[PDB]
Scaffold this active site. Structure first.
Site, mmCIF file in Angstrom:
data_model
loop_
_atom_site.group_PDB
_atom_site.id
_atom_site.type_symbol
_atom_site.label_atom_id
_atom_site.label_comp_id
_atom_site.label_asym_id
_atom_site.label_seq_id
_atom_site.Cartn_x
_atom_site.Cartn_y
_atom_site.Cartn_z
ATOM 1 N N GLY A 1 12.969 24.334 24.221
ATOM 2 C CA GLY A 1 13.823 25.476 24.485
ATOM 3 C C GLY A 1 15.140 25.239 23.773
ATOM 4 O O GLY A 1 15.403 25.823 22.718
ATOM 5 N N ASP B 1 21.731 21.843 20.898
ATOM 6 C CA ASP B 1 21.414 20.954 19.785
ATOM 7 C C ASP B 1 22.526 20.900 18.753
ATOM 8 O O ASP B 1 23.503 21.636 18.823
ATOM 9 C CB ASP B 1 20.015 21.211 19.174
ATOM 10 C CG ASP B 1 19.913 22.435 18.264
ATOM 11 O OD1 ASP B 1 20.816 22.743 17.464
ATOM 12 O OD2 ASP B 1 18.839 23.069 18.316
ATOM 13 N N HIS B 2 22.336 20.010 17.783
ATOM 14 C CA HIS B 2 23.354 19.689 16.810
ATOM 15 C C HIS B 2 23.911 20.905 16.071
ATOM 16 O O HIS B 2 25.100 20.954 15.795
ATOM 17 C CB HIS B 2 22.762 18.702 15.802
ATOM 18 C CG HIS B 2 23.790 18.023 14.955
ATOM 19 N ND1 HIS B 2 24.659 17.082 15.460
ATOM 20 C CD2 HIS B 2 24.087 18.136 13.641
ATOM 21 C CE1 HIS B 2 25.447 16.646 14.492
ATOM 22 N NE2 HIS B 2 25.116 17.267 13.376
ATOM 23 N N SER C 1 29.999 17.358 13.124
ATOM 24 C CA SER C 1 29.111 16.395 12.482
ATOM 25 C C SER C 1 30.008 15.410 11.732
ATOM 26 O O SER C 1 31.052 15.000 12.233
ATOM 27 C CB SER C 1 28.096 17.141 11.572
ATOM 28 O OG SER C 1 27.520 16.307 10.576
ATOM 29 N N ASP D 1 21.209 14.854 20.204
ATOM 30 C CA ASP D 1 21.222 16.311 20.015
ATOM 31 C C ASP D 1 20.321 16.750 18.863
ATOM 32 O O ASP D 1 20.442 17.875 18.362
ATOM 33 C CB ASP D 1 22.653 16.826 19.795
ATOM 34 C CG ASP D 1 23.256 16.358 18.481
ATOM 35 O OD1 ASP D 1 22.551 15.663 17.702
ATOM 36 O OD2 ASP D 1 24.444 16.650 18.234
HETATM 37 K K LIG Z 1 18.586 25.171 19.597
#
Ligand SMILES: [K+]
Ligand SMILES: [K+]
Ligand SMILES: [Zn+2]
Length: 427
Positions: free
Chosen positions: A323, A398-399, A155, A357
């Site tokens: 998901g 994701d992030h 990040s 993301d």
């Molecule tokens: K996730």
């Protein structure tokens, strides 16, 4: 449709995934590191290094002694411990969760070397905050041109480690020229302590999530996200510190965590200075950083991009993948996934910026391009010093998943540490 703030804490908690046990994380499919180090299967590697890794969290990340043991790096899995146990010397640095990249870089310097944070007389005067901050013992006190490190930043941590590497190498003309007493060595230049810089999910060109939100709302939202991890009640317990000492925003004597958080949220800081994370995260602010924070010629740069959106075939907008994407990031992903901008004096944001993301646009993650002269090439089976080696995209992730919230990632990190240990010396 709407990005929630603390006003919507109940709905956030409701929509959120339950924190898992370490056992249950270990049952998830492990993330696979995608490549072998160049030539490992054609010849002997002979020029490797023994430099340790230093991990650097992003926006609203906290230290090993915070959040009742929940780790930024791995969550319920302690990645630092796993790395050390498998022979990869690793430390964790902790810096201001919502401070500027400059401030975070100064904090990172002190966190590594030891001593009292020094933001620079010139900088502190310009931005009207304290020159000196908190004091740290030092986690790698012997760092030197000989005892180099590998920096890994997730990040905003990726911007922060780029910034530290820039300052170490070249210093700050503003600080050097202002004639202050006892200038921090950080600002003098000439230090080649960093062998590699790896950014993971980093807004190297900013994130339009900052552009599109009022600052206070972005911070409030991120407290909500923190609450999905701590629990909604423990969110207002004294288990984290925003580290805004330099701004005169320490928690006051006898003040509750809730009153402290409200006071920080209501501060003028969020719309009255560019020396704060919300500005530095914006595309304008990241572009500004890029105009002076360059890839140094004797350092290896790696970038990792996470993605957890798909294109809507109806509108062309990017939307969360159900998901892979944490439900907490549905509104953020969906707003970024349709956010454009063509306004004077600001970067032009078009459809290439839509994929994300949940927190950072994918296009921004491979390296700095806005206002930058850095070279970026997609990884091609050889590593190149002095430029960005843009590594294979980490899709369906994701992030937060990439730091273990929520995902089984320990083997990926162990393999990456092994990869980094092969890197040979600058000529
Ligand atoms: K996730
Ligand atoms: K904004
Ligand atoms: Zn500052």
């Amino acid at each position: 449709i709407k990005i929630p703030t603390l006003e919507d804490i109940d709905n956030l908690i409701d929509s959120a995934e339950e924190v898992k046990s370490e056992e249950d994380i270990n049952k998830m499919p492990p993330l696979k590191f995608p490549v072998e180090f160049p030539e490992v299967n054609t010849r002997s590697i002979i020029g490797g290094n023994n430099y340790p890794i230093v991990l650097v969290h992003g926006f609203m990340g906290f230290g090993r002694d915070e959040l009742l043991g929940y780790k930024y790096w791995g969550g319920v899995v302690d990645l630092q411990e796993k790395l050390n146990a498998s022979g990869h010397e690793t430390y964790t640095a902790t810096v201001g969760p919502v401070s500027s990249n400059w401030d975070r870089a100064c904090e990172l310097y002190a966190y590594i070397v030891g001593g009292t944070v020094d933001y620079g007389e010139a900088h502190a005067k310009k931005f009207k905050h304290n020159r000196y901050g908190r004091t740290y013992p030092g986690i790698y006190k012997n760092i030197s041109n000989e005892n180099k490190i590998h920096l890994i930043g997730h990040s905003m941590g990726g911007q922060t480690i780029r910034t530290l590497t820039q300052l170490l190498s070249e210093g700050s003309e503003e600080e050097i020229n202002c004639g202050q007493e006892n200038i921090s060595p950080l600002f003098e230049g000439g230090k080649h302590w960093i062998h590699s810089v790896s950014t993971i999910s980093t807004p190297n060109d900013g994130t339009t999530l900052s552009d599109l939100m009022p600052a206070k709302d972005l911070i409030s939202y991120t407290f909500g996200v923190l609450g999905t991890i701590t629990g909604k009640n423990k969110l207002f317990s004294s288990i984290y510190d925003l580290k805004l000492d330099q701004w005169g925003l320490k928690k006051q004597n006898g003040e509750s965590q809730r009153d402290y958080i409200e006071r920080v949220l209501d501060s003028n800081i969020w719309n009255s200075t560019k020396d704060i994370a919300t500005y530095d995260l914006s595309t304008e602010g990241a572009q500004e950083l890029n105009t002076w924070v360059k890839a140094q010629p004797d350092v290896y740069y790696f970038s990792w991009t996470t993605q957890a959106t798909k294109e809507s075939i109806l509108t062309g907008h990017s939307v969360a993948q159900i998901g892979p994407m944490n439900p907490i990031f549905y509104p953020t992903a969906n707003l970024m996934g349709r956010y454009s901008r063509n306004q004077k004096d600001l970067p032009i944001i078009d459809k290439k910026w839509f994929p994300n993301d949940g927190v950072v646009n994918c296009i921004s993650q491979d390296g700095p391009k806005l206002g930058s002269n850095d070279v970026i090439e997609q990884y091609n089976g050889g590593v190149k010093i002095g430029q960005w080696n843009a590594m294979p995209r980490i899709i369906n992730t994701d992030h937060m998943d990439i730091v273990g919230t929520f995902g089984n990632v320990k083997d990926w990190y162990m393999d990456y540490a092994s990869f980094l240990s092969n890197l040979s010396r600058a000529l």
